[PDB]
């Protein structure tokens, strides 16, 4: 179902996209996994630790 849903979005079925390094302006040699992640802040702010 994930494969089908990706296929609906006109995105590669393999789930790996080509990428270009910004600093080099060069394409990578391997398709890379690019997606979306839900990130959280963990209350351990360094400014209160150091």
């Amino acid at each position: 179902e994930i494969k089908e849903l990706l296929k609906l979005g006109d995105l590669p079925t393999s789930g790996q996209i080509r990428l270009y390094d910004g600093r080099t302006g060069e394409q990578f040699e391997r398709p890379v996994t690019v997606g979306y992640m839900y990130m959280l802040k963990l209350n351990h702010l360094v400014d209160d630790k150091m």
Binding site: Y36, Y38, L40, N43
Partner: protein, 100 residues
């Protein structure tokens, strides 16, 4: 709202105390970043009552961990509201959905 969920976020959002929930279905008479004024529906109002409910939203209190606790309205004027609906999005809450 997180893109990928589990379906229980609605339940935990409802059963938390942060989110204001409409005790009686009705129509919102008035909105404000401080309070919400709901005009309860006639069939739903308790008989012999003013028929207007007021909800006060706590604004920038202090958590037990020194975190801000701000609740924001999530509706506009005149929107119909049913019984048990979510009105004030509390911290980490989005349209009655948990969002950390």
């Amino acid at each position: 709202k997180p893109l990928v969920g589990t379906g229980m976020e609605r339940a935990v959002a409802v059963d938390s105390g942060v989110t204001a929930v409409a005790k009686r279905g009705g129509v919102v008479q008035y909105v404000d970043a401080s309070r919400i004024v709901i005009k309860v529906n006639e069939d739903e109002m308790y008989p012999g009552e003013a028929g207007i409910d007021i909800y006060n939203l706590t604004k920038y209190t202090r958590s037990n961990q020194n975190t801000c606790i701000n609740q924001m309205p999530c509706v506009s004027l005149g929107e119909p509201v049913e019984r048990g609906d979510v009105l004030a999005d509390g911290p980490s809450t989005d349209l009655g959905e948990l969002a950390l």
